[PDB]
Ligand binder design. Structure first.
Ligand code: NA
Length: 199
DNA sequence: GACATGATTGCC
DNA sequence: GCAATCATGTCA
């Protein structure tokens, strides 16, 4: 609470926000009062209407993705492949948000392991957008919550960034190629390294 | 109402 | 290399 990043932090455009997320710690307070912690090491920016890789492309706006259009810091959690969740945080700009792709586990590792068992090496706990949601017990109920004012989840300030193309956007179009994915260089917790982009 | 599909994960 | 599994986006 005293460390929780507030409203002013989130009110930034997608790219600066996605880059600013690196190093920050995502915290999840479970019912047993225990708190799980993960330092963000990989994120992706979705610019909005012009961004053909975003759900909000062409100004598309529905009840499912309303979060992207809500105040910065508002969560947009959705179900993919009818089996996994993806956690995004609305940024400045309607239809713009930041997807979280990987965290470096810091605390509550044992609970995460249990959560993701449905023996896992720590490297398999949060190395992915859906894995991290599973590891932190994030689900559809976290959709549209305010990361700056929620009792169960918040971001804390943390004490070389690689910019690469996003994952699972395809190999067609200028937007699929744009370097809108950012992660901690040399980090062993990133979900997908891009040796090419690192050079 | 119907029908194609996914910013993944993980086993063959 | 590809199946799992179903809410959502579209078209009607
Ligand atoms: Na937004």
């Amino acid at each position: 609470h005293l460390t929780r990043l507030g409203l002013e932090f989130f009110d930034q455009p997608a790219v600066p926000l996605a880059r600013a997320f690196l190093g920050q710690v995502l915290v999840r307070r479970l019912p047993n009062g225990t708190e799980l912690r993960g330092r963000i090491v990989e994120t992706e920016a979705y610019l909005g209407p012009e961004d053909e890789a975003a759900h909000s492309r062409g100004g598309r706006q529905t009840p499912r993705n309303r979060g992207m259009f809500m105040k910065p810091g508002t969560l947009y959690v959705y179900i993919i492949y009818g089996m996994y969740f993806c956690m995004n945080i609305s940024s400045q700009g309607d239809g713009a948000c930041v997807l979280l792709r990987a965290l470096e586990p810091l605390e509550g590792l044992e609970t995460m392991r249990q959560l993701r068992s449905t023996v896992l090496k720590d490297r398999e706990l949060c190395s992915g957008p859906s894995k991290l949601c599973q590891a932190l017990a994030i689900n559809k109920s976290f959709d549209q919550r305010d990361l700056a004012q929620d009792e169960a989840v918040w971001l804390e300030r943390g004490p070389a960034v690689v910019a690469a193309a996003r994952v699972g956007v395809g190999h067609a179009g200028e937007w699929a190629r744009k370097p809108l994915r950012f992660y901690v260089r040399g980090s062993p917790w990133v979900s997908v390294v891009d040796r090419v982009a690192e050079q």
